[PDB]
């Protein structure tokens, strides 16, 4: 299987408008509530089927979160005056990340369910994001996730959900199987770049050929600093935008893999679907909506992972087309689907666009009086978007962490 | 077929600050082509497939033209001050078609009036398209006769050339082809500011029939139109109020000819409508490229409805079928906008199939809070089209309109 990737060019990124009211996330309130005073949560992963549908089980909604403890009373984060450095505690989350689950009858007011896997089950101490798939009405679940440090592998672990009128348990996630890692020909490896990105599996059944595929975040293969920013990467920039500076250091891509069969036990990597060399280093958490005969491929990125000479917000970006292997076109012409507002540029991250149009994200940093800011580590308000052809439009907002079921599955 | 709606929600995506869709700045010291006439809307000689053509090596353009009056007491105050801005605003009622020619596609030589005074049924001769019909030099000039009423019309004539230049001759009998009907397009009785003008004929690349697009307004008594869900589109919270938007009712119209002679026309329903968005979708014209129909139209900042903001310049809609549906170029519709620091520098853009875009100079700011009037050609600029998007490229000299193909007369 061979196909050329869709290039997200610099010329495309010069169309990004951070001030478009149709593509701006609503402002998060400075007095947002926090789901936990003992843990931070961030990347949130709704339970779903391989076709994309977000599901409850026996009337319980279930989400997985990356989770790290809070350390307010810990001397290493306390200065001479006993002030707590929450910002540093929050920045330290990534090395402590573990998968936990939460549940609710209502799609909000989440009840903590605890760790998915016992400590030591994961091959790496870090357990980074992926997708929990409900496989059947017996309650079997495949959790696809990323094992990081040493190395980075996309992995899966099988377990089960059981419920009662009192709540949910996830059990028996006891054997992790690594599936694949970066190869060095299509996707950049650790030996080529110790800051390589390789993570966030999103598995699905393709609506057209019915095979099991996954997309994931990668980087375009090649030694750090070797990539070329040539015509394709620059695109048809206007006069005075020819200089790229050190843009060749930014090399994000959305990757694709295909399973040998529908069990998803053996995978083969395919070439990059969408590349952003010279544009942005991080095309994170890629995921699809299948709607109106089109593939809508969304990906999250940061203002500060852009190449020199470009400006855009943290938030959701997207590419659309009629065929799984492309070519794709940038949503809203620039690629930007939902950007943080410029007055609160880091208020939310790790958005997940669900097929009902609702978009969930977590709160990162919200400005407060005195040119300060508060840390979130909790769910943001959900907001709905509508897709129309190659364009999107932001609509109304919902409560914090609202993630309703699209379908309820009753267990056998 | 149902029209494509350009909605308010689409228009809220218009970005006046995008470097890929901004016209280059016009220099304060631009040259003027004539110190005796203003020119504005410029119409290159072309074939019915869109190709811009020279004839025996001569490029030819038509312009709307009006005299300048710098020594006329009606524009002069007691102190000798010349009200050029008023003279320029008064051009519309003095408009006549003239032609110009050049071996080089610039440094245009004045050819004079196309039609003798009195040939046109109306004194005003407003814009359209000159079509070179064959290698004998026959030409159909499609144009608009305005006041009283507004009719799309045509007049047949011919071009002859020599080593010394070009003549356009024998344009002596105008035939009116059609006017607004009142069910598809708005009429004078429904709105005395009705828009109905600017014919752009072409042979469709798919069915081989002769059609034309033109500027209209959606039919209905002034003030009666509804700005409902389709016109509003999926606006975000806080953008529900439309104020007086139902008074802005621009559309791009379509008509079809009985046969390839283009002597008898039937109107068809509007292709693209902008009720509640903008009153003026002017000079519609196509490029046929990459299996698509790119339909461009020019509009003004000051013809937008309340609650919307966009620049003077070129807008566009793209699709795969003549009858639609079409999608707005660059998501918002904007293709090339004037820069916000010189918002009225150019107008009446004509995108040619080689990507070059010609426009005229209107007003350019100068030293102080002052400005200069144009009435002369602006620098040509090239755009490139990529799917449903466009990107501005390099600029060329003032009024550069090179031929795509030369036709030797037999």
Author numbering:
A (entry chain A): 20 to 431
B (entry chain B): 22 to 431
Authors' own words:
Among them, levansucrases (sucrose: 2,6-β-d-fructan fructosyltransferase, EC 2.4.1.10) catalyze both sucrose hydrolysis, with the release of glucose and fructose, and levan synthesis. Levansucrase from Bacillus subtilis, Bacillus megaterium, Gluconacetobacter diazotrophicus, Erwinia amylovora, and Erwinia tasmaniensis was extensively purified, and their structure was described. ,− All of them display a single domain with a conserved five-bladed β-propeller topology. ,, Comparison of different levansucrases shows that the architecture of the central substrate-binding pocket is also conserved. In particular, the enzymatic mechanism of sucrose hydrolysis and levan synthesis involves the action of a catalytic triad including two aspartates, acting as a nucleophile and stabilizer, and a glutamate as a general acid/base catalyst. To gain insight into the binding mechanism, the X-ray crystal structures of the beta levansucrase isoform from P. syringae pv actinidiae (Psa) in its native form and in complex with TPIS were solved, confirming TPIS as a competitive inhibitor of levansucrases.
To provide a structural rationale for the multivalent effect observed in the enzyme inhibition by TPIS, we first determined the crystallographic structure of recombinant Lscβ in its apo form. Nevertheless, this N-terminal region of Lscβ was not introduced in the model due to a lack of electron density. The active site is structurally conserved, with the catalytically essential residue Asp62, the nucleophile Asp219, and the acid/base catalyst Glu3038. Whereas, both enzymes present differences in this region compared to SacB: Ser164/Ala148, Arg360/His321, and Glu340/Gln301 (SacB/Lscβ numbering). These differences probably reflect the belonging of SacB to GH68 subfamily 1, instead of the subfamily 2. The two active sites, which are deeper compared to those of α-mannosidases and do not face one another in the dimer, are 55 Å apart, a much greater distance than that between two iminosugar-ending tails of TPIS (roughly 25 Å).
